[PDB]
Amino acid sequence: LPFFPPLYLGGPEITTENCEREPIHIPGSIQPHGALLTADGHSGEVLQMSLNAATFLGQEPTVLRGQTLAALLPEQWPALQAALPPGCPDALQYRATLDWAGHLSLTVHRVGELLILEFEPTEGPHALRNAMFALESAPNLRALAEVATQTVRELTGFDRVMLYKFAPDATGEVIAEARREGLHAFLGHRFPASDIPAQARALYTRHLLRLTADTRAAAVPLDPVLNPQTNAPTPLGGAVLRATSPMHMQYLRNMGVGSSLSVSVVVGGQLWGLIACHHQTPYVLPPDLRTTLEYLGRLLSLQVQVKEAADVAAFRQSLREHHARVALAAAHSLSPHDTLSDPALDLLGLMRAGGLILRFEGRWQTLGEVPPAPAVDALLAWLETQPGALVQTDALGQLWPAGADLAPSAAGLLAISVGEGWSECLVWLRPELRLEVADLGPRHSFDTYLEEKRGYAEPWHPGEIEEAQDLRDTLTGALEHHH
Amino acid sequence: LPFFPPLYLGGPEITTENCEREPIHIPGSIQPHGALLTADGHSGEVLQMSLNAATFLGQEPTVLRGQTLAALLPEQWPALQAALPPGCPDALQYRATLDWAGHLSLTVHRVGELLILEFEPTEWDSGPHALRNAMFALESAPNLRALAEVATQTVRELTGFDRVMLYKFAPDATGEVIAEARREGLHAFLGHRFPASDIPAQARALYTRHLLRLTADTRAAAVPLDPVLNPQTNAPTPLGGAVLRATSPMHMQYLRNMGVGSSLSVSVVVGGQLWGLIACHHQTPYVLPPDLRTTLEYLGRLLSLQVQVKEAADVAAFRQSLREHHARVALAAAHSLSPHDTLSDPALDLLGLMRAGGLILRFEGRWQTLGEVPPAPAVDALLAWLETQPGALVQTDALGQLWPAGADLAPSAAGLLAISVGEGWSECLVWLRPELRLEVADLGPRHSFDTYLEEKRGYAEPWHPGEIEEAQDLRDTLTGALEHHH
Numbered sequence: 018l019p020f021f022p023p024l025y026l027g028g029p030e031i032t033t034e035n036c037e038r039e040p041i042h043i044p045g046s047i048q049p050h051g052a053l054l055t056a057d058g059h060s061g062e063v064l065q066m067s068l069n070a071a072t073f074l075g076q077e078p079t080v081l082r083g084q085t086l087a088a089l090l091p092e093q094w095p096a097l098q099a100a101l102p103p104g105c106p107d108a109l110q111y112r113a114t115l116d117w118a119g120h121l122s123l124t125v126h127r128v129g130e131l132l133i134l135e136f137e138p139t140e141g142p143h144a145l146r147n148a149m150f151a152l153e154s155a156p157n158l159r160a161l162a163e164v165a166t167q168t169v170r171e172l173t174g175f176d177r178v179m180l181y182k183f184a185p186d187a188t189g190e191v192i193a194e195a196r197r198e199g200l201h202a203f204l205g206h207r208f209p210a211s212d213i214p215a216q217a218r219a220l221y222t223r224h225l226l227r228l229t230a231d232t233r234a235a236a237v238p239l240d241p242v243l244n245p246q247t248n249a250p251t252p253l254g255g256a257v258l259r260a261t262s263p264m265h266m267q268y269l270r271n272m273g274v275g276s277s278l279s280v281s282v283v284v285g286g287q288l289w290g291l292i293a294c295h296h297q298t299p300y301v302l303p304p305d306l307r308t309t310l311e312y313l314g315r316l317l318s319l320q321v322q323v324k325e326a327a328d329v330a331a332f333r334q335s336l337r338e339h340h341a342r343v344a345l346a347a348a349h350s351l352s353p354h355d356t357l358s359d360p361a362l363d364l365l366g367l368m369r370a371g372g373l374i375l376r377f378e379g380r381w382q383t384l385g386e387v388p389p390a391p392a393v394d395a396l397l398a399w400l401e402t403q404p405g406a407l408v409q410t411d412a413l414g415q416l417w418p419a420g421a422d423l424a425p426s427a428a429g430l431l432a433i434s435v436g437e438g439w440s441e442c443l444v445w446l447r448p449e450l451r452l453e454v455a456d457l458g459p460r461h462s463f464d465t466y467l468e469e470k471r472g473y474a475e476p477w478h479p480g481e482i483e484e485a486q487d488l489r490d491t492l493t494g495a496l497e498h499h500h
Numbered sequence: 501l502p503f504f505p506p507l508y509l510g511g512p513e514i515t516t517e518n519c520e521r522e523p524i525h526i527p528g529s530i531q532p533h534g535a536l537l538t539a540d541g542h543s544g545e546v547l548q549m550s551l552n553a554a555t556f557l558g559q560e561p562t563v564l565r566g567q568t569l570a571a572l573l574p575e576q577w578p579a580l581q582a583a584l585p586p587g588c589p590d591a592l593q594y595r596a597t598l599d600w601a602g603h604l605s606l607t608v609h610r611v612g613e614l615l616i617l618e619f620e621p622t623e624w625d626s627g628p629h630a631l632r633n634a635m636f637a638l639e640s641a642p643n644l645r646a647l648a649e650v651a652t653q654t655v656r657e658l659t660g661f662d663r664v665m666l667y668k669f670a671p672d673a674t675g676e677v678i679a680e681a682r683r684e685g686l687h688a689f690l691g692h693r694f695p696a697s698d699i700p701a702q703a704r705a706l707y708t709r710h711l712l713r714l715t716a717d718t719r720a721a722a723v724p725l726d727p728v729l730n731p732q733t734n735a736p737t738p739l740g741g742a743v744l745r746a747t748s749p750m751h752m753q754y755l756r757n758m759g760v761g762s763s764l765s766v767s768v769v770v771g772g773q774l775w776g777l778i779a780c781h782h783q784t785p786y787v788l789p790p791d792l793r794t795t796l797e798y799l800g801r802l803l804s805l806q807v808q809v810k811e812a813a814d815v816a817a818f819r820q821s822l823r824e825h826h827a828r829v830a831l832a833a834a835h836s837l838s839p840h841d842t843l844s845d846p847a848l849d850l851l852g853l854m855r856a857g858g859l860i861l862r863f864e865g866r867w868q869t870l871g872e873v874p875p876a877p878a879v880d881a882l883l884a885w886l887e888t889q890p891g892a893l894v895q896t897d898a899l900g901q902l903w904p905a906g907a908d909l910a911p912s913a914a915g916l917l918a919i920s921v922g923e924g925w926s927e928c929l930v931w932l933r934p935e936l937r938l939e940v941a942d943l944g945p946r947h948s949f950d951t952y953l954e955e956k957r958g959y960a961e962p963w964h965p966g967e968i969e970e971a972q973d974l975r976d977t978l979t980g981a982l983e984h985h986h
């Protein structure tokens with residue numbers, strides 16, 4: 018839906034009912050650990066300041082306003098414009114160090130008509146270089162995820178560093194963690210989509226790093242709050258010193274988090290996940306170290322893509338070698354009920370399933386954790402209704418309404434008709450999804466995730482549905498031996 | 501084929517006839533701008549040295565040999581093993597700075613049983629925002645070429661190399677300079693293409709795993725290892741993953757003949773595949789320091805990512821362009837009158853759709869041309885040949901090969917793309933492309949460029965998959981405008 022006006026333009030209260038619609042990109046204020054100016058793209062006339070900017074740079078409130086950047090930044094003003102040519106993206110950032118009244122770090126980016134400048138204080142090197150090689154030589158996605166979080170924590174000294182991976186449905190999961198000895202084990206925890214809303218996700222896809230240095234600090238407004246050019250909200254979406262959403266700063270406080278920081282991992286223009294960081298006390302990470310994190314953000318964006326592709330390939334291999342061992346016994350031997358229900362074949366483990374139903378020559382027969390006998394009959398009745406020679410679902414209760422009661426033993430379904438109709442068929446079953454534990458916050462969020470996944474099960478990997486289809490073909494080929 | 505033994509084990513001469521089989525990974529020697537040691541994976545006993553190593557570190561020839569790394573590197577020896585656990589890949593590299601008799605930069609990697617250590621002098625250099633800004637520039641570049649320019653430009657600004665080129669491989673393993681950044685007053689290599697054999701198999705393969713190698717002085721003498729063989733196995737010490745590995749003699753010739761004193765190249769890898777190189781040249785010898793090489797290595801991988809992004813974005817907007825064009829064709833196809841009138845209209849630009857030099861149309865028994873097309877009697881003979889072919893779609897980069905008797909009509913129409921509108925090839929439509937041609941600006945590039953053109957004799961610009969895809973979708977939609985004409 019269309020986001021509401023900001024609080025400073027008669028906008029409504031950002032409650033937990035409508036926070037999907039917070040204009041997080043135009044808070045009209047910054048964090049107090051730095052300063053911020055805006056200026057005309059062409060003229061270089063300074064138009065807005067953060068109130069602290071006067072004190073932070075070492076000049077006076079209305080002497081800066083209505084002044085050329087040519088004057089303020091004689092060395093940088095020309096080189097700045099070379100780096101940020103008119104009409105360039107807002108994602109593009111030029112950086113430089115300065116001398117005043119101390120050493121400052123200037124970070125500039127352009128929002129079409131308006132230049133936006135961020136000032137904050139500034140000032141062995143093989144930590145990154147070695148980590149780069151470590152990431153690359155890690156054997157799988159988990160191992161990569163561990164090296165990432167471990168490294169980031171070693172570099173930053175954050176209390177908690179987690180790699181937070183998004184799922185198809187926009188829900189999150191902590192797949193690796195690195196924390197200080199004596200802390201909550203967030204590893205494994207999953208959280209709903211709404212905990213990181215649309216506009217937040219969208220913004221994190223273009224601008225790949227944002228932080229909250231002090232979760233208790235007061236925001237520093239811009240003066241004037243609006244851009245004199247257009248009389249419009251100044252978009253700070255691509256500014257590191259942008260004021261964090263009040264609603265989120267609550268979440269952080271309730272976790273006892275003083276400082277936060279997150280780095281986007283993007284794969285194929287898609288927000289794959291975050292390196293989320295926490296400190297229980299406020300902590301301003303210096304610009305040169307943030308830069309080091311930014312490199313990892315993108316080195317990881319690459320290796321994530323490589324390792325997932327390598328992992329799926331070796332997983333696909335495993336299913337194909339398994340599929341062969343099945344077809345070996347299928348051409349061979351005797352009745353299928355005898356052969357396929359053999360533990361040596363492990364026909365369950367093929368589709369990492371909790372239960373398995375087989376019907377052959379009119380008889381049905383089970384293996385593993387399967388619903389009560391009368392229900393199994395009613396299920397095979399329902400299967401005969403369905404078109405095609407393949408069915409699947411993460412939550413059977415939804416697709417088969419009258420089979421909602423048999424969710425605990427068999428929430429997930431994967432079915433294949435061997436011959437025609439569903440007379441000769443084969444059916445896998447998965448339990449209702451279940452995870453362990455270790456209002457506003459994670460304890461409530463974790464519970465509301467489990468509520469959303471009520472009656473749902475572990476979803477089927479495409480390669481499992483693909484190999485299941487190839488098994489329909491090869492197992493049809495061992496019916497003339499039995500007919 | 502199986503590579504020959506190295507020169508130092510009675511191996512044959514690496515001539516230009518058999519250089520595909522040079523064991524480039526085991527030269528048994530290093531470059532003189534650094535030093536090199538090998539040691540036991542478990543014990544840390546030093547087994548081999550480069551002859552200069554004694555002088556370079558500040559100890560004596562046979563005092564180092566048969567010594568623990570625990571003694572030599574008390575601070576590093578433990579942390580080293582933590583970073584390089586037994587059985588880890590040879591691609592994995594641990595780095596650290598030292599103090600002796602000066603500041604050294606140690607770079608270690610493991611080849612299973614054997615640890616290999618590289619020493620070379622170091623420093624802080626340059627300030628640090630050059631990379632950080634370049635990272636953002638690459639990302640915000642609008643297309644592959646623009647990205648390529650920013651890369652080469654940046655690399656040159658950082659290194660001060662005389663020439664920096666982004667060298668992109670093609671499907672057939674041939675190369676092409678797609679961007680260049682050189683010093684004012686130099687050979688314009690931009691555009692030049694070179695054959696596959698100029699960078700052979702084992703070279704390519706090695707450059708896919710170890711993503712950077714250099715030649716600091718093209719005239720310098722190699723420094724051998726003593727002993728040349730590994731005492732463990734009595735085997736060639738593989739230096740493939742060592743920066744100070746001695747460059748192939750055969751390649752150092754190539755560089756000398758171009759007047760290149762120093763070379764350096766960084767692999768760009770996309771999907772486990774060697775996409776291309778950032779190739780650098782200096783006309784005088786030039787040792788690039790380790791901390792600056794590291795900066796180049798980051799770009800090597802930032803670029804590996806953006807190349808993949810920008811190519812995917814470029815193909816997507818190109819695919820869009822063909823689809824909007826395809827629509828404008830089908831708009832006039834349902835409409836109007838005879839197809840010969842409609843399709844041969846310049847406003848439609850049925851040529852430009854498939855970026856073709858010539859175009860043949862046949863409809864209701866008559867054939868009709870547009871643009872640069874072979875002589876009339878040949879066109880008849882071509883349509884005869886087309887009727888032989890199965891399916892409703894033909895393609896080729898070099899028609900002369902697939903249609904032997906049509907080899908003579910290569911200059912006007914080397915490339916072919918055909919689609920039968922109805923059935924058979926009675927009602928059909930055929931695009932033609934000229935023989936591939938590029939401009940100019942023994943052993944070296946001048947000969948290589950010419951031998952590339954020789955290999956591409958009778959060949960044409962190949963058809964983008966999306967052009968062959970949209971051509972197939974045009975068969976369907978244009979069949980749908982035949983009941984209007986029948």
Ligand SMILES: *C/C=C1/C(=C/c2[nH]c(/C=C3[NH+]=C(/C=C4\NC(=O)C(C=C)=C4C)C(C)=C\3CCC(=O)O)c(CCC(=O)O)c2C)NC(=O)[C@H]1C
Pocket residue numbers: 033036037039041203208211212213214217227228229260261262264265268277278279291293294459462
């Ligand atoms: C209904 C609105 C809600 C609010 C929305 C919201 N959230 C963010 C930014 C983040 N929210 C996150 C959620 C988590 N962080 C964690 O550490 C954990 C568990 C350990 C969870 C579930 C995260 C990770 C971020 C990233 C930012 C950061 O880590 O510092 C925003 C936008 C913040 C901004 O950029 O200004 C918004 C609007 N959060 C909710 O949970 C609901 C109630």
Ligand SMILES: *C/C=C1/C(=C/c2[nH]c(/C=C3[NH+]=C(/C=C4\NC(=O)C(C=C)=C4C)C(C)=C\3CCC(=O)O)c(CCC(=O)O)c2C)NC(=O)[C@H]1C
Pocket residue numbers: 515516517519520522524689694695697698699700703713714715746747748750751754763764765779780945948
């Ligand atoms: C028959 C053997 C040949 C020899 C093979 C060869 N080449 C290399 C390394 C390279 N060769 C390259 C060829 C070019 N470099 C250029 O700059 C241009 C045009 C401007 C061409 C055509 C390139 C780019 C490399 C990369 C290395 C580098 O740039 O420094 C090796 C192995 C080198 C090593 O790592 O030891 C070998 C064996 N070159 C030939 O042309 C043929 C005759």
